[PDB]
Design an enzyme around this catalytic site. Structure first.
Site, PDB file in Angstrom:
ATOM      1  N   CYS A 132      -1.019  -2.802  10.561  1.00  0.00           N
ATOM      2  CA  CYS A 132      -2.141  -3.602  10.055  1.00  0.00           C
ATOM      3  C   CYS A 132      -3.096  -3.772  11.236  1.00  0.00           C
ATOM      4  CB  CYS A 132      -1.661  -4.980   9.544  1.00  0.00           C
ATOM      5  SG  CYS A 132      -2.927  -5.784   8.480  1.00  0.00           S
ATOM      6  N   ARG A 170       0.215  -8.165   7.464  1.00  0.00           N
ATOM      7  CA  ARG A 170       0.327  -7.606   6.120  1.00  0.00           C
ATOM      8  C   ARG A 170       1.230  -6.373   6.127  1.00  0.00           C
ATOM      9  NH1 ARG A 170      -5.761  -6.670   6.177  1.00  0.00           N
ATOM     10  NH2 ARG A 170      -5.450  -5.529   4.180  1.00  0.00           N
TER      11      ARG A 170
END
EC number: 2.8.1.1
Length: 267
Positions: free
Chosen positions: A223, A228
């Site tokens: 990410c 994430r």
């Protein structure tokens, strides 16, 4: 799937079950301080889980000390949940696996599903008597550092879980733009239903196959700072069972600032 994931009905039925502890993990504790799942405690992703000075997250002994102080034991089943799409709860899940914690699960859909289902929330303070937790040294088969990431170009799958425009190099961040050469782009949110829950095995295997996940290769997800990508790492390793998946926690803020690092543009 019950080994790594629990549903909201299971969670509601087991609030006060023996050796089960709910842990809310978010950017701040401010959401938890407002309200939270009854008897759950909190970890501050920023001040509890990161080194205050070095760019890292806490080591074994700091992790042990933290859990000991929050009253979490080695033999506890830990149930992780959070707002911001469960991003931070998945990151903590990854930290728990890194340090060898065996019984830990994400609450499927996290805070979003809890509140959509309309389930009760407690405004009451929670204290747990301090324990003695002892973390195992890091299982670095689930973490990637810059040097191995460089060495994995054209060797391993590289799942860039950022926005399509970050990936192609149209936008830098919200340093260099673009993506790791040979990376495939699968924005983290494709793996998630509207209610916050994970998509089915069928949906997920198809998602990653269509995008070009090569089943002859091991995998790394990334990410900007690995938040994430934790969530993607969970989908790939814990839901779909791929045995060799690493979270590149350095991610693009490290990679995109490395001198001489290969970068590729376009979708």
């Amino acid at each position: 799937r019950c080994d790594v994931l629990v549903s909201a009905d299971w969670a509601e039925s087991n609030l006060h079950a023996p050796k089960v502890v709910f842990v809310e993990v978010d950017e701040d504790t401010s959401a938890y301080d407002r309200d939270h799942i009854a008897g759950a405690i909190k970890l501050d992703w920023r001040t509890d889980l990161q080194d205050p000075v070095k760019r890292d997250f806490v080591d074994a002994q700091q992790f042990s000390k933290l859990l000991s102080e929050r009253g979490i034991a080695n033999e506890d089943t830990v149930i992780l949940y959070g707002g911001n799409n469960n991003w931070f709860a998945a990151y903590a899940y990854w930290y728990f696996k890194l340090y060898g914690h065996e019984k830990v699960k994400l609450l499927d859909g996290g805070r979003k599903k809890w509140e959509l289902d309309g389930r009760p929330l407690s405004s009451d303070p929670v204290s747990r008597p301090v324990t003695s937790y002892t973390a195992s040294p890091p299982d670095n088969t689930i973490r990637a550092f810059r040097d191995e990431v460089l060495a994995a170009i054209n060797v391993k799958n590289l799942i860039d879980v950022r926005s399509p425009d970050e990936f192609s190099g149209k936008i830098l961040a919200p340093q260099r733009p673009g993506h790791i050469p040979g990376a495939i782009n699968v924005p983290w949110s494709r793996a998630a239903n509207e209610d916050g829950t994970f998509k089915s095995d069928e949906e997920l295997a198809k998602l990653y196959a269509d995008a070009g996940l090569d089943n002859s290769k091991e995998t790394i997800a990334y990410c900007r700072i690995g938040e994430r990508s934790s969530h993607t790492w969970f989908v790939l390793r814990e839901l779909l069972g791929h045995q060799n998946v690493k979270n590149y926690d350095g991610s693009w803020t490290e990679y995109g600032s490395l001198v001489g690092a290969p970068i590729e543009l376009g979708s």
